[PDB]
Amino acid sequence: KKVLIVYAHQEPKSFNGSLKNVAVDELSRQGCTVTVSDLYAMNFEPRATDKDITGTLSNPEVFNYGVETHEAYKQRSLASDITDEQKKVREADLVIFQFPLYWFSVPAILKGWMDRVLCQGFAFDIPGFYDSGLLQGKLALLSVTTGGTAEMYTKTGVNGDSRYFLWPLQHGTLHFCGFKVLAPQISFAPEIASEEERKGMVAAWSQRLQTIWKEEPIPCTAHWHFGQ
Amino acid sequence: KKVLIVYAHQEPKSFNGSLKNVAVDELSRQGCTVTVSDLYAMNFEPRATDKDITGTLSNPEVFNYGVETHEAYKQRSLASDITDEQKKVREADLVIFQFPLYWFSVPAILKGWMDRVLCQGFAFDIPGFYDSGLLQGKLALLSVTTGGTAEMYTKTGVNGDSRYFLWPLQHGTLHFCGFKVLAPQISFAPEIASEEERKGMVAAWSQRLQTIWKEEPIPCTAHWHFGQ
Numbered sequence: 001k002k003v004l005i006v007y008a009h010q011e012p013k014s015f016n017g018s019l020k021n022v023a024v025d026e027l028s029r030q031g032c033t034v035t036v037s038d039l040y041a042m043n044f045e046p047r048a049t050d051k052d053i054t055g056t057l058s059n060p061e062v063f064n065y066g067v068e069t070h071e072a073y074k075q076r077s078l079a080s081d082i083t084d085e086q087k088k089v090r091e092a093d094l095v096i097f098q099f100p101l102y103w104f105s106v107p108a109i110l111k112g113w114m115d116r117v118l119c120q121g122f123a124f125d126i127p128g129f130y131d132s133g134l135l136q137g138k139l140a141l142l143s144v145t146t147g148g149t150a151e152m153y154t155k156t157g158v159n160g161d162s163r164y165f166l167w168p169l170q171h172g173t174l175h176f177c178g179f180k181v182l183a184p185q186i187s188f189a190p191e192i193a194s195e196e197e198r199k200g201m202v203a204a205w206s207q208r209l210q211t212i213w214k215e216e217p218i219p220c221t222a223h224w225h226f227g228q
Numbered sequence: 229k230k231v232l233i234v235y236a237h238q239e240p241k242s243f244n245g246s247l248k249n250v251a252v253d254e255l256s257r258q259g260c261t262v263t264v265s266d267l268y269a270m271n272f273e274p275r276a277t278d279k280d281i282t283g284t285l286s287n288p289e290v291f292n293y294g295v296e297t298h299e300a301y302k303q304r305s306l307a308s309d310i311t312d313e314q315k316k317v318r319e320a321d322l323v324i325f326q327f328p329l330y331w332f333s334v335p336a337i338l339k340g341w342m343d344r345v346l347c348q349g350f351a352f353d354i355p356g357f358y359d360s361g362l363l364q365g366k367l368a369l370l371s372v373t374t375g376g377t378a379e380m381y382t383k384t385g386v387n388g389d390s391r392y393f394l395w396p397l398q399h400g401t402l403h404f405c406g407f408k409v410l411a412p413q414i415s416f417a418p419e420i421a422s423e424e425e426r427k428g429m430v431a432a433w434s435q436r437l438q439t440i441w442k443e444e445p446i447p448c449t450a451h452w453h454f455g456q
């Protein structure tokens with residue numbers, strides 16, 4: 001089995017850093033092939049620009065990012081930073097995203113990875129999405145850490161249920177590209193927690209990873225995210 | 229009245245470009261004070277890094293972006309690009325976000341604006357969020373364009389209701405910072421539409437802007453976004 005960890009945290013000594021490291025330790029112990037894309041260390045480009053296509057454009061007068069990257073993918077003219085990520089995804093059986101929640105979503109550096117790496121022709125097609133998605137047969141998992149407590153992330157809590165913010169990521173992005181979505185790993189408020197509680201959350205993730213290949217994906221539907 | 233348009237599109241000749249320009253035209257005609265932050269033209273930095281603080285870090289051994297930027301805001305040691313955006317937001321009565329929908333969310337360049345500009349001490353505090361957010365008294369409006377049709381963005385459609393993807397932006401971000409949220413302007417599938425239909429969508433936005441100051445904000449709640 002091959003795993004890609006797309007990691008988005010500035011500090012190796014952080015709780016995010018610890019979750020990424022135990023995932024590497026545990027999956028490596030199992031004999032999996034492991035690759036980590038440490039976005040901040042890579043100074044990963046988040047902006048979707050005309051620099052993402054090398055050589056000449058399909059329409060140089062009117063720049064359309066979607067059209068240009070779709071054509072560049074088919075013509076093998078995408079920037080090397082994008083194709084390097086695409087090769088990692090193409091080979092992966094499982095893609096784990098490790099990140100702190102920023103504004104109920106991914107940090108911009110990781111949003112940039114999604115915007116630029118998951119181009120038409122590679123991840124999805126127009127038309128050719130959801131179960132017609134080009135990353136079918138692959139698994140994806142969001143391992144998120146929050147500032148807010150589990151209680152704040154409930155239906156009647158100030159932030160609403162944690163499943164509400166998962167919709168654009170799990171459904172709009174991952175499911176759209178054909179991934180089977182494994183249940184998210186949500187590590188609530190580690191900064192507020194004790195050293196023992198943090199060790200507990202890190203151990204819970206390592207223990208979950210021991211049987212990750214036996215898991216069934218979630219039914220990635222509106223009912224799962226919002227229903228009763 | 230003072231308006232800030234935070235604009236995220238690479239192409240001035242685009243439909244997004246047209247929506248931004250008619251907003252400038254109409255608001256300027258009304259006599260409003262108008263400022264546009266054209267993120268791609270500014271090469272706006274989306275990454276949340278240690279480069280966003282120029283002074284002595286509160287903890288140089290373990291970098292915590294949230295803590296460091298909160299302190300840097302209070303000390304006036306944030307990078308000038310952040311400070312420049314904060315001044316525009318501080319003076320604005322209304323903040324319009326003009327952008328194409330990328331993965332059920334904002335393009336990464338605009339996610340970066342939210343991550344870096346809306347720091348603790350400026351946009352919110354603990355306590356001092358949601359109805360007590362520091363941007364209370366201000367209005368915010370999302371003017372979004374999509375690839376998907378209105379029909380795809382319905383409860384029984386493949387993408388689910390359009391309100392579902394608005395939650396992290398409207399509630400998790402804007403309402404969290406104390407903004408009152410005006411109803412979104414969603415311009416569905418302009419690329420698929422005819423030249424006449426595109427003119428119609430641009431005119432509908434210009435027409436709506438004529439009476440924008442008379443609008444009441446939406447009740448930015450879980451019920452509004454998801455029903456029941």
Ligand SMILES: Cc1cc2nc3c(=O)[nH]c(=O)nc-3n(C[C@H](O)[C@H](O)[C@H](O)COP(=O)(O)O)c2cc1C
Pocket residue numbers: 009014015016017099100101102103104105145146147148149190191276293294342343344400
């Ligand atoms: C720019 C920014 C935005 C944040 N937005 C949220 C948010 O929407 N919800 C939340 O619960 N925490 C939010 N947080 C807090 C982080 O999620 C939290 O600090 C992190 O998950 C802790 O993990 P770490 O100790 O490894 O950094 C935000 C933090 C920053 C810096």
Ligand SMILES: Cc1cc2nc3c(=O)[nH]c(=O)nc-3n(C[C@H](O)[C@H](O)[C@H](O)COP(=O)(O)O)c2cc1C
Pocket residue numbers: 048065066114115116172237242243244245327328329330331332333373374375376377418419
């Ligand atoms: C990286 C990327 C991601 C996109 N994700 C979505 C999406 O989640 N939903 C959608 O309906 N359209 C999506 N689109 C299509 C754009 O929203 C659409 O092309 C744009 O709104 C059209 O406006 P414009 O002609 O001014 O660029 C995406 C486009 C790109 C380039």
Ligand SMILES: [Zn+2]
Pocket residue numbers: 170171172175219220221
């Ligand atoms: Zn789904």
Ligand SMILES: [Zn+2]
Pocket residue numbers: 398399400403404447448449
């Ligand atoms: Zn709200």
